[PDB]
Write a protein that holds these residues in place. Structure first.
Motif, mmCIF file in Angstrom:
data_model
loop_
_atom_site.group_PDB
_atom_site.id
_atom_site.type_symbol
_atom_site.label_atom_id
_atom_site.label_comp_id
_atom_site.label_asym_id
_atom_site.label_seq_id
_atom_site.Cartn_x
_atom_site.Cartn_y
_atom_site.Cartn_z
ATOM 1 N N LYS A 280 1.027 -1.011 0.120
ATOM 2 C CA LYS A 280 0.112 0.020 -0.127
ATOM 3 C C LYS A 280 1.280 1.280 0.019
ATOM 4 O O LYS A 280 1.287 1.729 1.147
ATOM 5 C CB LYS A 280 -0.794 0.155 1.186
ATOM 6 N N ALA A 281 1.337 1.720 -1.322
ATOM 7 C CA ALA A 281 2.044 2.411 -1.211
ATOM 8 C C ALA A 281 1.655 4.019 -0.935
ATOM 9 O O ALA A 281 0.340 4.287 -0.811
ATOM 10 C CB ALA A 281 2.635 2.357 -2.546
ATOM 11 N N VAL A 282 2.260 4.913 -0.026
ATOM 12 C CA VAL A 282 1.894 6.217 0.619
ATOM 13 C C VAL A 282 2.652 7.062 0.942
ATOM 14 O O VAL A 282 4.222 6.878 0.374
ATOM 15 C CB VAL A 282 1.841 6.034 2.034
ATOM 16 N N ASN A 283 2.253 7.934 -0.254
ATOM 17 C CA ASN A 283 2.888 9.310 -0.657
ATOM 18 C C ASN A 283 2.440 10.732 -0.539
ATOM 19 O O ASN A 283 1.543 11.020 -1.346
ATOM 20 C CB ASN A 283 3.964 8.815 -2.166
ATOM 21 N N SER A 284 2.204 11.205 0.200
ATOM 22 C CA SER A 284 1.652 12.196 0.886
ATOM 23 C C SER A 284 2.702 13.826 1.455
ATOM 24 O O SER A 284 3.472 13.478 1.893
ATOM 25 C CB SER A 284 0.455 12.129 2.123
ATOM 26 N N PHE A 285 1.283 15.004 1.457
ATOM 27 C CA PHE A 285 2.448 16.158 1.761
ATOM 28 C C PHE A 285 1.520 16.637 2.561
ATOM 29 O O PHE A 285 0.407 17.038 1.793
ATOM 30 C CB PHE A 285 3.169 16.738 1.389
ATOM 31 N N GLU A 286 1.155 17.144 3.742
ATOM 32 C CA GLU A 286 1.060 18.743 3.825
ATOM 33 C C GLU A 286 1.550 20.153 4.309
ATOM 34 O O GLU A 286 2.405 19.798 4.902
ATOM 35 C CB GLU A 286 0.129 17.978 5.086
ATOM 36 N N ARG A 287 0.866 21.058 4.382
ATOM 37 C CA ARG A 287 1.470 22.437 4.780
ATOM 38 C C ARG A 287 0.714 23.444 4.838
ATOM 39 O O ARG A 287 -0.799 23.361 4.708
ATOM 40 C CB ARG A 287 2.927 22.165 3.703
ATOM 41 N N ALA A 288 1.382 24.530 5.094
ATOM 42 C CA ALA A 288 0.582 25.641 5.614
ATOM 43 C C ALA A 288 0.372 26.729 4.010
ATOM 44 O O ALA A 288 0.854 26.370 2.859
ATOM 45 C CB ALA A 288 1.119 27.104 6.496
ATOM 46 N N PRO A 289 -0.247 27.698 3.726
ATOM 47 C CA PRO A 289 -0.681 28.106 3.038
ATOM 48 C C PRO A 289 -0.100 29.729 2.598
ATOM 49 O O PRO A 289 0.935 29.073 1.692
ATOM 50 C CB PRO A 289 -2.531 28.802 3.097
ATOM 51 N N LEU A 290 0.502 30.783 2.494
ATOM 52 C CA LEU A 290 1.253 32.141 1.980
ATOM 53 C C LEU A 290 0.550 32.942 3.491
ATOM 54 O O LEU A 290 -0.388 32.989 3.281
ATOM 55 C CB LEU A 290 0.811 32.101 1.162
#
Length: 50
Positions: free
Chosen positions: A33-43
């Motif tokens: 179950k390959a997983v590749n995610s990413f979260e961050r803030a806006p600007l």
RNA sequence: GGGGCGAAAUGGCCUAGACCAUGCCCCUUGGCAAACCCAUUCGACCGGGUUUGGGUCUUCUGACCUCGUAGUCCGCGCUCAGCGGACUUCGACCA
């Protein structure tokens, strides 16, 4: 899928060779179950020195 | 030793000119800043000698810390560190 040669021989008469090729679909557990995610803030803000 | 000069100080020549005499201008390079050693009141005492001094990885080409020197676009925003940051060059024991 898995192939095999059911190579049988006859009784005491003749002496022939038969390959007899045949396959069988084989089951197996699921793949990873390959997983590749990413979260961050806006600007925020345009200033550079601060 | 090596050079320079007729300028510049005057004297021969001395419309002018270009050369001459003494005659006057420089080099005798220089500096490293640290650490350790002697005989003794068996250290206080000045003087000498040795190991280092931009630095490593293959200090071969070439790169990895650092900076110095310049030229170029540059941000007025995108990135987890953030930030003000980008690319190309020559030098790096000191006057």
């Amino acid at each position: 899928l898995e192939e095999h040669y059911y190579s049988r021989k006859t009784c005491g008469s003749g002496g022939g060779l038969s390959v007899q090729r045949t396959g069988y679909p084989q089951t197996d557990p699921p793949v990873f179950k390959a997983v590749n995610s990413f979260e961050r803030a806006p600007l925020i803000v345009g200033d550079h020195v601060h």
